[PDB]
Inverse folding.
C-alpha cells in the first residue's frame, strides 16, 4: 500500500464535481474530470427508486443532490458517487484489462466534504463507501483544511469560499476548523449578475454573464483608462460597455467583510486571532475575477484594521509643530494580509487558484496514502470494529 | 450484631462510592490525555506538510 | 461490463445498520439509535471524455 | 467504551453550547437569548441576531431564556431554541440519541420543579429517548480529575461558589454572587458613556453593544489588580513621592488605547481606570452605599467554605477545599483574576496552603461547563449517571 495510480479524489459541489484518479508523481495536475452534480431518479410502480445517468425514455426525474453546498438528498448523492466510481472502473478496466490486479486492486478514496454536512450524512456516506462501493480506505477531508494544506500548510487562517449563491467563512486555528465560528451568507457570484441587471436594464442574462466572464470586467482599488471598452457575446456578438464593467462586485464584498469581522472578533485567544487575520484565504470561481481578491482585502482593511483615526493623527502632527510616536492599540488586527500562494505548482499557476482546495487534497492524499501510518483514514479493520462510527476516531 | 451489620451495610456503599469515584476519575483523566494526543497528532501533521 | 460486478472485482467483511438499541446493566427501560453490527443473517455508466476538459 | 453518541447541551444564562459527545469542541455556541421580531417570530443564533440587531427595526426585542439562578424560566422559548439547535446545528431528530444537559448547583429547593419542566420538554414535546442532568460545578470538577473541590465560577450572572466533597455537592454552602460579566458590561458602558456620546424595550441596542464593542473592551482593557486597589494606590503614591523627593514611575499612570469603531475614535484609559472595573466584583460597596463588603467575592468565598465546615473537622474541610480550588468561567479569564481570587482567599485563611487549578486555554473555560458535561457523556458505564427515561416521568405523574 498504496499505488499512486490508484488514489481517487472526489470533490463534489452544487453545480459540478471535480474528479481525479491517480497522482502524477512529477507535479500535481489540475483536475481534468468535471462531472455535473446530478442524477436521474426513475420511480418504479411499487414505490422504489432507480438511478440513471440519462433521462431514461423521459421516465426519470432530475435530482440535484447538493444545493448551496448542502446535501439535500443523501440517497441520490450516494448513487451519484457510485456512478462516478463505477465509470472510473469501467474506463480503466477496458484500457488495460489487467487492471483488477494492478490499478484497480486497492483504491483508497479521499472525499472532500463541506462544512454543512451532518454527522448523519457523513456516517451514511462512510457506510456507502465501505458497504456498497466495497472500497477499503477512506479519508473524509474538510474543504477548509484542503485549503490550508494547499496554502503551504497554515496553522491559523481564515477561508473565504465564494460560491454561486452563498459564501462560506471558516476560521482555522491550530489546524482545526472552528465549527462554532463557521457560517455562510446567502450571497455569492450571482449577486454580481443581479447588481449588473440593475445597472444595465436593457441587457439580458447571457449578456450580463458574458461581461462578468470577460477580460474587461474588473474590480478597481490599460483598461481602467478607457471610458468604454468592448467584449464579445457567447454567440460572437460585439458589445460595448462603460463604467459598469468596474461595478457589481461591491455589495458582495461588503457583505463578506462584515461577516469576516464578526467572525474573527469571536476568536478568544488574541494571539491566535492576530495570526488568522494575517492569513486570509479566498477561493472559488468568482475570485478569479480580475481585482476581486485585492478588492476584498481592501475592504477588510477599510473596515477592520486597528489604526489611528486620520483626524486624530492630523491634530497630533499639528501639535508637534511647536516627530509623532505611533499610538499603540490593545486590539487586533493591526495587520491584515492575504495568505501567500505557493508559486511552485506550475500547472496550478497556469490555471489560477480558484480551485486550490483540490490541490490541498492532492497533497494530503499523497502524504497520507504513501506512508504506513493509518492514523488519518478509516480502514477495513476499523470499519469492521466500529462501523461508520469509525469515522470519528480519525478526524483531524 | 445489629450495629456491625448496618455499618458494613453503609460501607458496602462507602466502598461503592470509592469505586464509582475511582472509575470516573479514571475516565476523566483518560479523556483529557486523549484531547492532548489528538491536538498533538494534528499539529504534527500540519508541521510536516 | 455489469457495474455491480466491476465493484465486486475491484479492491480485493461486516455490515452495519442504524437502528434502535436497548442497553442492559436486565435491560434499561430506554432506547436510542446507534450503529449496530449485523448478525450472520441480517444501473448505468457514463463516458468520461465528455467530462474531460478540452 | 459504550456504543452511543450523545447530544450535549449547556444552557448558560448568557451563552448556550451544543454539540455531539464524539468530538472535542461544540458545534455551536449561540446566545441564550433571542429576538422576537413582529405575526410573531423568533430569531436565534449569534450572527442571525447581530445582523437583525444592526437593522435597528422597531418591534424587534431581545428576551432571555435563563434567569440569574442559571435556570431556564421561559420554557416555550426554550423549546424553540432546542428545536433550532437540533434542526439547524446538530441536524438530527431529537428522538434518536441520548441527551446530556446541565443544571447549576442549588440549595435544593427549585430542583424538583425544574426536573418536571425538563420531563415535559424532553418527553411530552421533543420525544427524547432518555436524558441525564449533570450539575455544572460537579462536572467541571470531574472533567478536571477532581472528586472534591472548591469550584469558583465567574460567569455572566455573577460568581458561583460551590464546595464539592468526595463527589457530593454541599448545597447549604452553595453561594451565588450577583456581580459578574453582565455587571461589568453595565459599568463599562456607564463609565465610557460620555466619550461615546450615549450619556427592557431598548433591549436590542443594549444587547448588540454588549455583544460587539463592549465584549472587545472587556477582553482587551480590563485587568484585575492583584491587591486591594485603594491600597495599591496609597502605596504607589507613597513610593512615587520618594522617587520625586529623593532626586530633588507610578505604574498606575500607564495609558491604554482602545479604537472605538462606531465613531472611529480612540478611547484612552490609565491603568487605574482599567483596574477599577473588576474592583467592583471584589468591593461592590464602591458603587452603591446599599451593598455590604460581604456581597463582595472575597468575603463570599470565605462564607461558603466556613458554611462547608458546618457539614454534615472544620479545619479539615477548610484544608481539603483549599487544596483543590477550581477557578473557572468566561470572566475568570480577565488578566489578573486568578491571582486576586487567590490573594483574597489566602488572607481569609492564613493557616492553610492554597493550591488552585484552572484551564489555561482561553476557549476551554468559556465553555468549560459544556466540556464538563461532555466528559460525563463519555463515561464508560451507563451506571455512572442518573438517566431519566420516559418511565420516571410516568411514575412521577401518579398522585
Amino acid at each position: 500500500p498504496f499505488r499512486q495510480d490508484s488514489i481517487l479524489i472526489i470533490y463534489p459541489r452544487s453545480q459540478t464535481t471535480l474528479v481525479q484518479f491517480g497522482l502524477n508523481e512529477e507535479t500535481f495536475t489540475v483536475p481534468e474530470l468535471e462531472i455535473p452534480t446530478q442524477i436521474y431518479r426513475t420511480t418504479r410502480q411499487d414505490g422504489s427508486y432507480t438511478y440513471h445517468s440519462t433521462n431514461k425514455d423521459n421516465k426519470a426525474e432530475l435530482i440535484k443532490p447538493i444545493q448551496n453546498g448542502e446535501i439535500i438528498d443523501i440517497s441520490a448523492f450516494t448513487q451519484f458517487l457510485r456512478l462516478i466510481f463505477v465509470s472510473i472502473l469501467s474506463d480503466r478496466a477496458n484500457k488495460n484489462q489487467d487492471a483488477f490486479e494492478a490499478e484497480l486492486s486497492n483504491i483508497p478514496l479521499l472525499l472532500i466534504t463541506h462544512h454543512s454536512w451532518s454527522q448523519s450524512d457523513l456516517e451514511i456516506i462512510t457506510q456507502y463507501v465501505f458497504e456498497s462501493l466495497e472500497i477499503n480506505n477512506l479519508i473524509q477531508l474538510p474543504a477548509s483544511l484542503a485549503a490550508t494544506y494547499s496554502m503551504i500548510s497554515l496553522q491559523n487562517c481564515c477561508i473565504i469560499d465564494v460560491g454561486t449563491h452563498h459564501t462560506d467563512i471558516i476560521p482555522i486555528v491550530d489546524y482545526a476548523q472552528l465549527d462554532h465560528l463557521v457560517s455562510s451568507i446567502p450571497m455569492g457570484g450571482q449577486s454580481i449578475n443581479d447588481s449588473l441587471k440593475k445597472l444595465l436594464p436593457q441587457w439580458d442574462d447571457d449578456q450580463i454573464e458574458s461581461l462578468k466572464k470577460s477580460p474587461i470586467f474588473e474590480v478597481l482599488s490599460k483598461n481602467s483608462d478607457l471610458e468604454f471598452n468592448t467584449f464579445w457575446d457567447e454567440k460572437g456578438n460585439e458589445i460595448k460597455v462603460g463604467k459598469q464593467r468596474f461595478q457589481g462586485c461591491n455589495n458582495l464584498i461588503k457583505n463578506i467583510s462584515n461577516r469576516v469581522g464578526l467572525t474573527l472578533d469571536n476568536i478568544d485567544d488574541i494571539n491566535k486571532a492576530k495570526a488568522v487575520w494575517e492569513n486570509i484565504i479566498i477561493v472559488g470561481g468568482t475570485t478569479s475575477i480580475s481585482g476581486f481578491k485585492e478588492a476584498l482585502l481592501g475592504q477588510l482593511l477599510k473596515d477592520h484594521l486597528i489604526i489611528e483615526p486620520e483626524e486624530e493623527k492630523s491634530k497630533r502632527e499639528e501639535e508637534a509643530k511647536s516627530f509623532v510616536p505611533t499610538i499603540e492599540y490593545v486590539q487586533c488586527p493591526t495587520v491584515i494580509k492575504l495568505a501567500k500562494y505557493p508559486d511552485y505548482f506550475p500547472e496550478w499557476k497556469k490555471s489560477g487558484y480558484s480551485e486550490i482546495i483540490f490541490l490541498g487534497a492532492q497533497i494530503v492524499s499523497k502524504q497520507i496514502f504513501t506512508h504506513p501510518k493509518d492514523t488519518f483514514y478509516i480502514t477495513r479493520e476499523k470499519y469492521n470494529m466500529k462501523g461508520p462510527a469509525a469515522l470519528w476516531d480519525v478526524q483531524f | 450484631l445489629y450495629k456491625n451489620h448496618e455499618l458494613l451495610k453503609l460501607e458496602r456503599k462507602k466502598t461503592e462510592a470509592v469505586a464509582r469515584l475511582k472509575s470516573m476519575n479514571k475516565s476523566a483523566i483518560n479523556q483529557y490525555n486523549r484531547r492532548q494526543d489528538k491536538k498533538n497528532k494534528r499539529l504534527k501533521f500540519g508541521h510536516r506538510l | 461490463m455489469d457495474p455491480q460486478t466491476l465493484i465486486t472485482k475491484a479492491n480485493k467483511k461486516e455490515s452495519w445498520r442504524y437502528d434502535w438499541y436497548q442497553p442492559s446493566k436486565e435491560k434499561y427501560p430506554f432506547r436510542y439509535k446507534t450503529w449496530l453490527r449485523n448478525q450472520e443473517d441480517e444501473e448505468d455508466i457514463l463516458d468520461l471524455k465528455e467530462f474531460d476538459r478540452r | 467504551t459504550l456504543n452511543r453518541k450523545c447530544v450535549v447541551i449547556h444552557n448558560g444564562s448568557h451563552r448556550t453550547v451544543a454539540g455531539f459527545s464524539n468530538v472535542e469542541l461544540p458545534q455551536c455556541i449561540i446566545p441564550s437569548s433571542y429576538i422576537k421580531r413582529t405575526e410573531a417570530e423568533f430569531i436565534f443564533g449569534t450572527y442571525n441576531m447581530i445582523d437583525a440587531a444592526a437593522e435597528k427595526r422597531n418591534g424587534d426585542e431581545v428576551y432571555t431564556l435563563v434567569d440569574s439562578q442559571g435556570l431556564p424560566y421561559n420554557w416555550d422559548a426554550l423549546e424553540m431554541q432546542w428545536r433550532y439547535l437540533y434542526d439547524t446545528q446538530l441536524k438530527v431528530s431529537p428522538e434518536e440519541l441520548p441527551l446530556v444537559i446541565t443544571m447549576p448547583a442549588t440549595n435544593g429547593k427549585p430542583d424538583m420543579a425544574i426536573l418536571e419542566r425538563y420531563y415535559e420538554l424532553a418527553f411530552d414535546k421533543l420525544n427524547v429517548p432518555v436524558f441525564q442532568i449533570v450539575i455544572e460545578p460537579l462536572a467541571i470538577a470531574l472533567s478536571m480529575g477532581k472528586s472534591s473541590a472548591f469550584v469558583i465560577d465567574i460567569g455572566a450572572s455573577g460568581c458561583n461558589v460551590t464546595p464539592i466533597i468526595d463527589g457530593i455537592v454541599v448545597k447549604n454552602a452553595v453561594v451565588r454572587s450577583k456581580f459578574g460579566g453582565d455587571f461589568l458590561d453595565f459599568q463599562v458602558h456607564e463609565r465610557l458613556a460620555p466619550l461615546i456620546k450615549e450619556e427592557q424595550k431598548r433591549s436590542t441596542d443594549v444587547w448588540y453593544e454588549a455583544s460587539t464593542w463592549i465584549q472587545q473592551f472587556k477582553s482587551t482593557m480590563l485587568q484585575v489588580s492583584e491587591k486591594d486597589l485603594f491600597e495599591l494606590e496609597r502605596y504607589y503614591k507613597e513610593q512615587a513621592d520618594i522617587y520625586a523627593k529623593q532626586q530633588e514611575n507610578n505604574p498606575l499612570v500607564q495609558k491604554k488605547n482602545f479604537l472605538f469603531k462606531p465613531l472611529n475614535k480612540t478611547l484612552t484609559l490609565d491603568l487605574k481606570e482599567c483596574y477599577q472595573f473588576a474592583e467592583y466584583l471584589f468591593k461592590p460597596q464602591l458603587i452603591s452605599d446599599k451593598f455590604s463588603p460581604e456581597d463582595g467575592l472575597g468575603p463570599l468565598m470565605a462564607k461558603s467554605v466556613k458554611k462547608a465546615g458546618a457539614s454534615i473537622s472544620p479545619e479539615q474541610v477548610y484544608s481539603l477545599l483549599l487544596t483543590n480550588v477550581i477557578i473557572t468561567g468566561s470572566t475568570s479569564l480577565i488578566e489578573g483574576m486568578e491571582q486576586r481570587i487567590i490573594k483574597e482567599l489566602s488572607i481569609r485563611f492564613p493557616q492553610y496552603k492554597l493550591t488552585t487549578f484552572a484551564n489555561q486555554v482561553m476557549m476551554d473555560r468559556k465553555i468549560q461547563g459544556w466540556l464538563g458535561a461532555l466528559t460525563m457523556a463519555n463515561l464508560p458505564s451507563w451506571s455512572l449517571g442518573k438517566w431519566y427515561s420516559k418511565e420516571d416521568y410516568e411514575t412521577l405523574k401518579r398522585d
